Structure formats: structure tokens, C-alpha cells
RNA sequence: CUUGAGUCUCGUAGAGGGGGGUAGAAUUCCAGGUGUAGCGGUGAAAUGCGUAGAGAUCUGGAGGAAUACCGGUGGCGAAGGCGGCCCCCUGGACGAAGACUGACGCUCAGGUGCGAAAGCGUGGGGAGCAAACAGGAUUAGAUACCCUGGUAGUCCACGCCGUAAACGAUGUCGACUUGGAGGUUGUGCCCUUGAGGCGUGGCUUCCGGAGCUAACGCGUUAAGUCGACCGCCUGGGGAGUAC
């Protein structure tokens, strides 16, 4: 959560790129779940078919660039 | 006959009464028309964890080429024994041509790369002297 | 001309020419976290015939108890 | 609670600390910056967080 | 299962040339000998149906090289059977 | 006859298998200290846990299960599948070069073995999770989702019928073959062309001309072209049910 730190006494210094372990880290997928062999990277490709918000802009930004109109 | 590496491990109270031991080894092998290609001991070291609640233990490193049936015998002569405390073996090995090879690195472990259980300043007066310029 | 400026384990026969041993501890020390962890190829400037060698040395020296293997110890 | 625990340890006239966490929830910063500005003197942060090496089979809760 | 100096001394003294290491009767000694130790091995490693697999496709392979050598003549294919004692 | 096919030498990568061992990490449980009235579970709680001393925190002890990182559309296995570290034994693959044998080859009905999970007979074991069972909540109801509680089961040894979206959905094997990029990995030669490159050989991810193409697309590892052999279909229900 907190880990330890080059950090001065952090609850003030608004770092929050890489501080936790499983607290909504991608450890926590089979953490308060069952074993799965295959899920985790099926559920990926899976995942992504529904999460098509920040699919699709990606998708934009790289045709766009692709074709020198951009 | 096979090519061998072996590490071993003995208690602190232990660390100065283990020349007898590498005398032993040594003649169990020679006995068995192998050779000692290389021969280093690395002290008493510190342990990121303690083993059988004690923080350090000591460390021997042997180099050989042997017949398999002494390293049966003795890899479990060792697992049987309660003073020699921890052992790893490894499979077709030989020294490197450089002495000392392994002391280089017992020497950093000793200084910056343990979770230090015990202090550093007991376990650091055993063992092969760290002469870097050799090694 | 001859020798060209390699790259970081690349170009070259003298290094990383055998497998990356867990008696070398001071090399492993380079490579590993806070927490006592193994870095991936993508950070390590290295292949994954390397990667395998890097990973299995240092799961021998935590197993050894001789390097960190979690945050925490006693 | 952070504040209720400082008046809590008050009478054995300790007033400084070091921080240890664990847990998920979000008890973690804003205890701390509460606790040093309820006249204590936070000094350390470390985490204490128990993480296993694999370990035993997790729970199910709402098919999560 | 054989080691180097085993699969040696069978083409040492079989082998229908110097460096033979084509010839039908060379081809079904190596497997025998490869077979009876291979047996042997599964015989404490019960489970191992790799170990199985390999063994099944060595009998399998040396019955057609068998085969074949009864197809050239049948005295020298039983002067194998004879040198190499297979069977009742 | 050596070219298909096979074999040894020799280079070589691998979570391939079977047998055994081991270190540390953690969830749990027991004892006891310290401390003192709280804790817990959900949308809400209720059921449940506490002052007969909980929760939280420290230290000693105990069990059984599993290997975080590494990790990749990566690597390996006939497929099913295979993931901590050490030893012992062990199948398979691939590849620069050496040769050798002398079409010895290929498929395959039936047959024989293997074959995730669930299962079940047998004995052992009982950390965790959790069919069943027990209680709670919710709701119009709730025999359900949801929570509290939890046995069997799993895990270990032995044995048994074997089934799966055994969905990489495309029978096995071979020749013929548009193009390109990524990863992975064997190799000869050399200014390690710069970066190692380059040819070359193996696997694989992605893309795609033409072809094929109800259609999605597939697409040289074809859902292509061609051959041998072998399996399946023939409207829907009755039904893989009955007998």
C-alpha cells in the first residue's frame, strides 16, 4: 500500500503511479477469485470486446496517424 | 564418473570446527580416484531468514569431479546429519580457472544483498579472505 | 577496420556466454527490486534465453536464503 | 479513529511514532496526516502488507 | 535407452561396412538393446507413458525392420532372432 | 539406385514424463503475553464474533495445501495437458556438418493403449476454499442470486466405465505452391557488414494478393490445388430414447 520510500512522509506528496501490491493491482484477478488455467488472458481479448470507449480511440489516433492525415 | 559442484552449510558454533569436516570430504573423494577442482569457504553468512531460529549459519564450497555413488553417499550423509544444517548440489559442473571466483560474491552478500537477521559484524570473521585482486 | 560498438549483452561472445549462475549473488544484487523480486526482459537489456538463466539463478540464492524473496523478513 | 487512538495511548505520555499499514481499505494516508497534526510526531512509513508465494485457494463473493 | 559407448560397440562389430550405420540388422540391435533396458526403466517408472510411447514405437519400428529382413531372405532374419535371442 | 524412408555420429533448446527431495513466503489453527470494548457482513444488514477478555498487536508452537515474481499470442508435450528451488532416472523434438543403409515407405476398418473436470470403489489426510447440510438476509415469494456457518470433495497411495464448447471447431500423411511484418530458435560464414548481419533451417503470433468463398472470411501452417487411405452427414420432433 504504502511500501517503503525515497518519499517525504507520503500522505502529502501526490505520487499514486505505482503504490499498491493488489489494492486494484492486476494481482487481485485470481486473489478473492477461483484458479482458472486459461481466464486471465482470454479475459483479456474478452474484456476488450465490451470496453469499447477506450478501444476505439486508440484505434482512431493510429488509422489517423496511419494514413498521413493526421 | 560425472563432474560435480556442492555447497554445505554448518552452525556459527560450528564455523571453526569445520576444517576437520573439509579434511574428511576431501579424503572420501581422493579415496574414490576423484579430485578437487576447486575448494573455497564462504564463511558464516546472514540469512534473510532465520534457519532453525538463528539468523546466520555457515557456508563451504567444494568443486569436484567425483564418482555419482560418493555424492549419493554424501549429499545424504549430509540430509541425515543435524550438524551440517542446509545443502545445495548441482549436476555436471566444473571450477571456473579463476580462484576464488565464488569468494568475490561472498563478499558482496555479506555487505549489501541479505536482510542482515544478525549483525554483520560476527558472521563477516569467517571463511576465505576476500583478497578481490585474485578473484 | 574490425570490432564495431556493441550493444548491452548483444554483438559480442564474452558475455553473458554461459548461464546466468545463482553462486555469482553479485551479479544477481543488479537485477532484482525492493522487494526482492525479478525484473523482466523488456528493463534488463537482455533475450529471453537469458531471461530464463536470470530468473532461475536468482530462485536459487531466495531458496538458499541468502536474498530477499518478499518485503518483509525476520 | 486515528485521532480517538492518539488520545487512546495520551496517558502513557507517548508522543511519537512510526507507521506500519496493511489492509485494503482506504484507512491509510488520512489517519497519518490526522495523527501528526493531533500533536504526535509521525516519523516513519512502512508497509507491512503480508503477500504469500502463491498460497491457499481465495473466497468467492458474488461470483467475483 | 542407451548410452553412446553401448550404441558403439554395437556397430563396433555389426554393420555391413566401415561407418555402417544404415544397415537393417544394426538398426534392430541398437533397438533391442535400447527395448530391454527401456522395459526395465518403465518397470519402476509405472506412470511414465512417455517413457511407454517411445518403448511401443522401438517394437513397432524393429518388427518392420524384422519384416523387411524376412522380406530379403528368412535365414538371415532368423540368424537375428538367433544373435539377438528374442521370443520363445 | 539414393533422392522417399530409416539410422548413428555431432551441434542444441525446452513449464515434456516418472521417482524422490527442499527453501522460503503466506492463509489457517493452538497457547500465552500486551491491551481494552469493541469486532464483523451487506445496498442496509441480519445471522455471526466480544468483555467467561474479542478486534489489533508481539512472541512460541502446530497443520495441510500451493508455488508471488519471472510471464510473452513465449517455451515444451500425442492429444489430455505441462509453471517455486535441488538430485536421480527418463521419452520426445529441433539443427550447421559427417556419413551409412538401400523404397526398408504411407494410411488404416476392426483392435489396443492414452484420454481436462466431474464421478465412484478402496485406504490415508482434513490449511484453504466449498456441492450437500444448517442458519441469516432480500423479495410479493426465494426452497435462488446475497451473507453468517460448513461436511463431503480436493490433496496423498491403489484400483474402475469414460466423458467434455477433448472449439486452434478444419480426419491422417504427402507433394505443389502470391507477398509482407512481429516473436522464438537451431546454424555456416564474415567487414561479427551497423546494429551482429546475411543466407539457411525449425516453430509460432499478426497481416494479406490470388485462389477458394451461402457468408464470416479463410487465405501457401489455405476454409486453396492435387493424390492415397480412413471417419461423419442426408428435413424437424420422437431419440443415443427405446429394445
Redesign the interface.
Same mark, same amino acid.
Given at each position: 500500500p504504502v511500501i517503503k520510500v525515497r518519499e517525504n512522509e507520503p500522505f502529502d506528496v501526490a505520487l499514486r503511479r505505482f503504490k499498491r501490491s493488489c489494492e486494484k493491482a492486476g494481482v487481485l484477478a485470481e486473489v478473492r477469485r477461483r484458479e482458472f488455467y486459461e481466464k486471465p488472458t482470454t479475459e483479456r481479448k474478452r474484456a476488450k470486446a465490451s470496453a469499447v470507449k477506450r478501444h476505439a480511440k486508440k484505434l482512431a489516433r493510429e488509422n489517423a496517424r496511419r494514413t498521413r492525415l493526421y | 564418473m560425472r563432474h560435480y559442484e556442492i555447497v554445505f552449510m554448518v552452525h556459527p558454533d560450528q564455523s571453526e570446527q569445520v576444517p576437520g569436516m573439509i579434511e574428511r570430504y576431501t579424503a572420501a573423494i581422493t579415496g574414490a580416484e576423484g579430485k578437487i577442482h576447486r575448494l573455497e569457504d564462504w564463511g558464516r553468512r546472514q540469512l534473510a531468514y532465520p534457519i532453525n531460529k538463528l539468523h546466520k549459519a555457515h557456508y563451504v564450497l567444494m568443486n569436484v569431479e567425483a564418482p555419482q555413488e560418493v555424492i549419493d553417499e554424501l549429499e545424504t550423509t549430509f540430509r541425515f546429519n543435524d550438524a551440517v544444517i542446509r545443502s545445495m548440489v548441482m549436476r555436471t559442473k566444473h571450477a571456473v580457472t579463476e580462484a576464488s571466483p565464488m569468494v568475490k560474491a561472498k563478499d558482496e552478500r555479506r555487505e549489501r544483498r541479505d536482510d542482515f537477521a544478525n549483525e554483520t559484524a560476527d558472521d563477516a570473521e569467517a571463511g576465505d579472505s576476500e583478497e578481490e585482486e585474485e578473484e | 577496420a574490425r570490432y564495431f560498438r556493441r550493444r548491452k549483452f548483444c554483438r559480442f561472445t564474452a558475455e553473458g556466454v554461459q548461464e546466468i549462475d545463482y553462486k555469482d549473488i553479485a551479479t544477481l544484487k543488479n537485477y532484482i527490486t525492493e522487494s526482492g523480486k525479478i525484473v523482466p526482459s523488456r528493463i534488463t537489456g537482455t533475450r529471453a534465453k537469458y531471461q530464463r538463466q536470470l530468473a532461475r539463478a536468482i530462485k536459487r540464492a531466495r531458496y538458499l536464503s541468502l536474498l530477499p524473496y518478499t518485503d518483509r523478513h525476520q | 479513529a486515528a485521532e480517538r487512538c492518539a488520545d487512546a495511548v495520551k496517558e502513557y505520555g507517548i508522543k511519537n511514532l512510526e507507521?506500519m499499514?496493511?489492509? +485494503?481499505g482506504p484507512g491509510?494516508?488520512?489517519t497519518? @496526516?490526522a495523527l501528526?497534526a493531533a500533536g504526535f510526531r509521525?516519523?516513519?512509513?512502512?508497509?507491512?502488507? +503480508?503477500?504469500p508465494?502463491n498460497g491457499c @485457494? +481465495? +473466497?468467492?463473493?458474488r461470483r467475483? | 535407452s542407451l548410452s553412446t559407448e553401448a550404441t558403439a560397440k554395437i556397430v563396433s562389430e555389426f554393420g555391413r561396412d566401415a561407418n555402417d550405420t544404415g544397415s537393417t540388422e544394426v538398426q534392430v540391435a541398437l533397438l533391442t538393446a535400447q527395448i530391454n533396458h527401456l522395459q526395465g526403466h518403465f518397470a519402476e517408472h509405472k506412470k511414465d507413458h512417455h517413457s511407454r510411447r517411445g518403448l511401443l514405437r522401438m517394437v513397432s519400428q524393429r518388427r518392420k525392420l524384422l519384416d523387411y529382413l524376412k522380406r530379403k531372405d528368412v535365414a538371415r532374419y532368423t540368424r537375428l532372432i538367433e544373435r539377438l535371442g528374442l521370443r520363445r
Open positions: - | - | - | 507507521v499499514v496493511k489492509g +485494503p491509510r494516508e488520512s497519518i @496526516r501528526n509521525i516519523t516513519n512509513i512502512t508497509d507491512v502488507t +503480508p503477500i508465494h @485457494r +481465495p +473466497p468467492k463473493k467475483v | -
